[PDB]
Structure formats: structure tokens, C-alpha cells
């Protein structure tokens, strides 16, 4: 696939600092070079200089405002132009806040998009429904239509437009939701397969569902939202709020094995990789590893093998 | 939920000193108040006062047949009047040993209960098949019906009366079980599904057939007895006797999750947790902490999430 | 079952030394002993005595052709010999290119043999499309009778005699397979089962599947190798290349105790343990232990219990 990598290095959208290295120390991992190994055509658009907001005290119980909106406003501008170049974008960020500005920027050029996001959390509490304060656990709450009207006029998101229904979001993975959380999931409707469903179900059924349910209308673009703190902290450790219980590596090979093969990827995010986090060097590693390797497979590779269109045995 | 809380420090029923230890550092870990965090009326019976029994000489083979008889006839009368007084009776405890009291106890004021055992084990050898002597590996024996009249008149046990039929219980998680009890799964015909058919069904499946065995005809009131080491020792390794190959921290609380969902939980037994064989202080932990989420799922904690009947958006 | 143990030290098939030492220490782990303990009639046929060939420079890329094609033909007669006697072969080996012989030793005797292999490779690479020049991952090109005229002779294998068709072999475990051994998966139409199918359907439809596809036309006798690198370095981390991601403990066992239901069973290889390669002394026992497990389920040893034919209770 054609590939526009987006590098966004924020963490305001919650309290620790080492998530704004995800980008670095992914790109360290020889991000790139892996996917040109692959049949990608990589073009980088470096990483996004987020100008410093020294002035910005919280909105009522919402911390660093300002800073949140104003790099998710810079994201979405940066990944409506990667997809005005016929390119999947590819944010290797911080924290899962900026997930504002990445959809916001991908539905201004296909307004069409079904979004898939996986993650421990829902992410979807409101200015009003938050208890913690941090961004990284809203940003949801912005892109739905149906909230349009629950959500105050927060400091940095005057540009910020609801673009996606509560029909066209599938969660996977699910395993720490708010009661306030919980309480919107249930009333708007919206589709999830928390770890209760995946264990009932299988990772097979769980993404024949998911699919069929985003793309069983017709074929759209789709979003990938891929939080790392989805899966278990036995494979993605260094990450700001790790929930035991989660997806399993293999899990999420095949969740984005799947994806791939539906050749309507058009938008991805691998969030809140914070090495700073990790206990030991080892767990930077085991994290940012597992992270590239979700990735990867994302853009065509594949655990059964991949090989050109020529004959190998001649 | 409504909760009658019973603390069981026994440890007789088996070699290792520290399971009488469980009560202890479970209600440490904060289980009273994390349940009440929920909405669950918790009332602590307190722990039971196991007097000492000094003269205790094995009977054949069978181990301190006196002290395990008599604490259980204890655990009996108490969890038949928390059973009186309209509560879910919650049984902390040492050894496995004590389901024969839990198990009596609510039978007296629910003769028409069905059991769910979560075990590596079947815990059904009878005093004279046994090879260990231990007798937190035989008391299924002693509740069986079907087998009335090869249990023989041990110490400690003139008060028990066998109340339940082979029919009324289902197995989940065997790995480890001796040609004596297999002999009996296979004559009595007792339901089970072993980690073989965990893996050939997926726990969905499983705990669909569980239920339905359990409930299809009629619906009753349902007594878990849950051995941590039913779940693999990478989740609960400070128990006596561990085996590879167990359930997952996931399936545990699928299985739970969907024995509260029933609303027929009536009967519970939290056992073998044993923090004097944790090899770390973070072994210990990981116990306690997998047995108390397992706890708190049986009374409504949810992974998808949980929400109060209100409107969070207003 | 009826067994006939054959110790393989060999190593020459790779470059990690330690291999050569897996007949020692599965033996040392009590294998022979474990499994006379159950209903098992053992002849241990004592370790080949592989003769040192200095003499052995690489053919084009293909390293020590000569001392692995002599192992894997001493190998194949001891093979056809213990299948004369009417026993099971029991390959305790050292790498995977004595498969060569121990399947050709095996067909030999019964041609109309159908093949499982779990492994986290295909080896299936002709000495023309390797890139490692490591014969353990081109075992299976030798073998098979589609690619009569694309394998060259290569020193040490005049002996050979392609025995099976593309198909009689399925692969269970795949997530490590190079391009030009994926072009030839699907240019021969091979069976296979990788971790993304395992992932989708589960490993007991994998294994009904692959069962009903080696047996369903007719009955036919089963060989069964197994590389422990198929199943996850968790479990099997003492071994030359494992790979992350891959069949868990209890699905290693479900697979062979699944085989062994079969009664076709004839031909077992337990290959690529290496002692050496355990970081730490654990490490090592964990892989052995492993080992040993999944042997023993391939003889009859059952999760939910084995029970001899009286009566336990009388
Ligand atoms: N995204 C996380 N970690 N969410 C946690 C919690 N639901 C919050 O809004 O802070
Ligand atoms: N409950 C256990 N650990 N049972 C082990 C063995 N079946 C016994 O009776 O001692
Ligand atoms: N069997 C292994 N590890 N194969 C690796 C690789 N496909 C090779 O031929 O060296
Ligand atoms: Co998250
Ligand atoms: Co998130
Ligand atoms: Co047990
Ligand atoms: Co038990
Ligand atoms: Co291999
Ligand atoms: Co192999």
C-alpha cells in the first residue's frame, strides 16, 4: 500500500510525560525501512513541530486544553493532506487524544470513513463526564454527531466538527469503561466487542462482525484507531494505563491481518507507546517490537508468508 | 448483589501451612470495601474460630480427619444461616477441604442447587481411594449421593449427609486427575470439561453447556466453588498445588461474569489461595489480586462496564 | 502404545550446537521411565552414532550436505527397522533436517503415510531457493514428489527418494515462512494452517479439519513432527529460531492428544531442543518439561484423567 507516515510527538493529553517519544523510538525500530521491505511506497512527513502553550490552565476539570486542540488541529490539517496525496496516513503518535485531529482530518477528504477502534478503554467521556481530566480519554466524544450538543465550547476546539455517527464506530478490546462511558455506549448504540465478547466469541467471529457490520452496506474507507494499551501489558508494557486481561499478541495480528485484507485501510493511528514507562530496556523493546510488528501487518504482512508475483522455483 | 461474607482459616485439609492465610490477605487486598464500591450490602460474618483438635491420628491414610470434619460442620452451620438470612454466602477460605461444609451448609436451605467446581482438580477421591491423604482432594466424595456407601465412617464426619447427585455438578478446568477419580467421572457419568475441552470448544461454548446442563430443565440456585489453581499459575502461583496448562485470567472471569448474569448465584467458595508460597511479594499479589477481580465479577463487575440507573449526560 | 525410541544427536542441519544434546537430556527428564508409567511398551533403540564427516564444504549455499544427508539416511533405515517390529518410531532428534530420514524410514515401510507438521516454518526450501543454506529448513522439498526436478543432487542425498505428495501433509503453527517457500505452499496447493487460521477458527476445528483432511478418504498411518520452535518460546524458549506469537501449551497438547485419539499414530518426531540456547537453567527444564508433556499426550496421556480397565471403587 501507498503509506504517508505522520510523526506526533504529544502527550498533554494526559499526565506522563515519555509518550511524546513514541515516534522516535518507533522510527528507531526501523519503522520505515521495514515497510519498504515490504510492497510500500513510504514517503514521510516527519514529525509535527507542536508549538509550546505555556499558557493553559485547565477548563474546569480538562487539563492542558489549548495544547490538546491545538495539536490535534495541526494533525487533522497534516492528515488531510497525506490523503489529498492518495495516501494511507500513518500517525505514529503520543497519546490516543490526538485521535481528534487524525479522524478529523481523514473525513474532510472521505466523509465516508467506518472506524475501528481498538483499546482497553472507550475513550468517549465528555468535557462533563470525565472524572480524570485527561484528554486522551475524550477524544470520542468530540468526533460523534450525536454528542454535538453535550460537549462545552472547551479552550483549542473551536475547529473541531462532530464528522461520524455512532453507527460507523466498532470497539475491540474493552476492558476499563467510566460508568459515565458506559452509560453512552448503551445509549447511542454503538457497536463494541469488549473482552467479554472476544472470549464468547473468538478473534475470528469478533472480526467477521466488526466488518461486516462496518462495510456490510457498502465498501467505505476505513480508520484504524489501534490504542497499544489494548492489548495485554504481557506484550505492550510500557504504556501510560495498562489493563491486565487484554488482547493477545496473535489477537492483534489478526485483527489488523484482517483489516489489511479488506484493502480499504485508509487511516491508522499506533498510540500511547510511552518507552519511558517501560520497568526495564527489555519492555521498551517487547512494547515498541509488538508495536512495529502490528504495523506491519496493517500493510500486508503476512504470518502464512507474502512472496512477489514471479515464479520461485523457476 | 447481597453478601454474607465467611471467613474460613483452614488449612488441614491439605500439607502447606499458609492457606489459612487467605481470609487475611484477601480482605487486605480490599475485597469488603470493593464490593461495596459496587452495588453490593455486605455483611461480614466475620472468620470462623477453628478450635484446635491436638489429638488428630490419620484414619487409614486420610489426614486429620477430625480437624477437617469439624471445621467444615462449622462452615456448614454458619454459611446455612448467612443462606437464612437471604444472603449470597461468601466463603474465604484455606484448603478445598471446606466445600463440604459450604456445600452442606446451602444445601440444607437449598436442597435443589447445582454446582459449578472450577478446579485443576475433580477433588472427588474418596477416603479409600485417595493416594495423598488429603483430604481437600476428596470432598466431592462426600456430597455425592451415588456414592453413599463407599465413603467409610471417618473421624470428624458423623454429621454429613450426601446432598448432591453426580447429576447436579459440573467440572471446569481438570488437568490434573488421578485413575481413581477418572474411574468415578466416567461410572457416575459427572459432567466436565476438561482443559481438552476448553480448548476444543472455546469457554463460550463451554459455559453455554454448563448453564444449559445446569439450568435447562428447571432454574435453581447456583454454588460456585472456585480453586484458584483452576487457573494457570502464571495468574495465581502462591496456591499448593499448581499445574501449566490452566485457564486464563480472561476465561476466569468469563466464566464468573457469566455465572452473575444468570442472577441464580447463591453459593460461593474463593479457595486454595495460599500466600506463604508465592516466591516473590509480587507472586503474592498477582494471587490475591486475580482472586479478588475473580470475586468481584461474580457480584456484577463487568469488563464491557457498569453504570448507575441515571442519565450521565442529563 | 507400542514405542520404538531412537535418539538422534544430530546438529549439522543448522549452525547452534546444542541441538545434538536433546536425546541426553529428554532422557534425563525421565522420558523412557514416564512412559512406561503409562499403558506404554518401550524399546529404546539407543542414539544413532552419527560418524564424523570432516570432510563437507558447502554445495553452493547448502552447508554440510554431506554430514546431513548421511544422519538423515541412517536415520531412515533404523526408522524402517523399528517399524518392522510393528512400533511407534520415536525421533528424539536434534534438528529438523533428520526428517529427511525419518519420514523416508517411515514411508518405506508404510508408503501410504499422511504427515502433520507443527512447526513455526514450513521448511520446505529446495537448496536452490534458500537463503540460509541451513538444511533443517529444507527437509520437506525432499520429500516431496512434486518437486522431482527441482531439488539437484546435492552431496549426501543419492539415497533420497521423494516419498509423499503435496497432498498428504498438513502444517500446523506457520507464522515464519520465506517467499519462496509461500510461492511453493501455494503453487502445490499444500494444507496448511498458520497462526492467523488458527487464530480465526480455533485449534479444535483446526484439528478436525486437518484430521478429516489426512484421513477421510481412508484410514491411513499418521507421522507426526514435531519442532518445538511451532509452539511459543514461552513455552519452548530453549530452541535455535523460535518465533513470538506462536501455539500455546494447551493447544500443543490439544493437537496431540487429538492424534493420539486417532489410533493411526506410527511416527513421532520431537526435534530441535537445544539445552544450550536456554538463557537461564529454567529456561531449559521449561523446554525439556514441555517437550516431554507433548510426547506423552501423543501415547494416550488425557487432561481429564486416564483410568485402567477395573474397577477403582469395587
Ligand atoms: N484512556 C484512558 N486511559 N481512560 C481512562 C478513563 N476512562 C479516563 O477518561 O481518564
Ligand atoms: N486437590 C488436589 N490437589 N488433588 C490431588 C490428588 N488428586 C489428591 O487427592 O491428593
Ligand atoms: N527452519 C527454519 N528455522 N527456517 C528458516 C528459513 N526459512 C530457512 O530456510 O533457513
Ligand atoms: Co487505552
Ligand atoms: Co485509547
Ligand atoms: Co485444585
Ligand atoms: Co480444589
Ligand atoms: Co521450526
Ligand atoms: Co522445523
Not at 245 to 268: C, D, Q
Request: with cysteine; charged share 25%.
Amino acid at each position: 500500500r501507498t503509506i504517508g507516515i505522520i510523526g506526533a510527538p504529544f502527550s498533554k493529553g494526559q499526565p506522563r510525560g515519555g509518550v511524546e517519544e513514541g515516534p522516535t523510538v518507533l522510527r528507531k525500530a526501523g519503522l520505515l525501512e521495514k515497510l519498504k521491505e515490504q510492497e510500500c511506497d513510504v514517503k514521510d512527513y516527519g514529525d509535527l513541530p507542536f508549538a509550546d502553550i505555556p499558557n493553559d490552565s485547565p477548563f474546569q476539570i480538562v487539563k492542558n486544553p489549548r495544547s490538546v486542540g491545538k495539536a490535534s488541529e495541526q494533525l487533522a490539517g497534516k492528515v488531510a493532506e497525506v490523503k489529498k496525496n492518495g495516501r494511507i496516513s500513518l500517525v505514529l503518535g503520543g497519546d490516543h487524544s490526538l485521535a481528534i485531529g487524525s479522524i478529523s482530518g481523514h473525513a474532510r477528504v472521505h466523509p465516508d470513513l467506518g472506524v475501528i477502534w481498538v483499546d482497553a478503554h472507550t475513550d468517549i467521556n465528555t468535557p462533563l463526564t470525565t472524572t480524570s481530566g485527561n484528554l486522551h480519554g475524550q477524544p470520542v466524544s468530540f468526533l460523534l454527531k450525536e454528542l454535538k450538543g453535550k460537549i462545552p465550547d472547551v479552550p483549542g476546539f473551536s475547529w473541531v466538527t462532530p464528522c461520524i455517527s455512532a453507527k460507523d464506530i466498532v470497539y475491540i478490546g474493552l476492558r476499563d469503561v467510566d460508568p459515565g462511558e458506559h452509560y453512552i455506549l448503551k445509549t447511542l448504540g454503538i457497536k463494541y466487542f469488549s473482552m467479554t465478547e472476544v472470549d464468547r466469541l473468538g478473534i475470528g467471529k469478533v472480526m467477521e462482525e466488526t466488518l461486516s457490520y462496518l462495510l456490510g452496506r457498502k465498501k467505505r474507507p476505513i480508520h484504524l484507531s489501534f490504542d497499544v494499551d489494548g492489548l495485554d501489558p504481557s506484550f505492550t508494557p510500557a504504556t501510560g494505563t495498562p489493563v491486565v486481561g487484554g488482547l493477545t499478541y496473535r489477537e492483534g495480528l489478526y485483527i489488523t491481518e484482517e483489516i489489511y485484507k479488506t484493502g480499504l485501510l485508509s487511516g491508522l493511528d499506533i498510540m500511547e507507546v510511552n518507552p519511558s514507562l517501560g520497568k526495564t530496556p527489555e519492555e521498551v523493546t517487547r512494547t515498541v517490537n509488538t508495536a512495529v510488528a502490528i504495523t506491519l501487518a496493517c500493510f500486508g504482512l503476512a504470518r502464512e508468508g507474502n512472496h512477489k508475483p514471479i515464479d520461485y522455483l523457476n
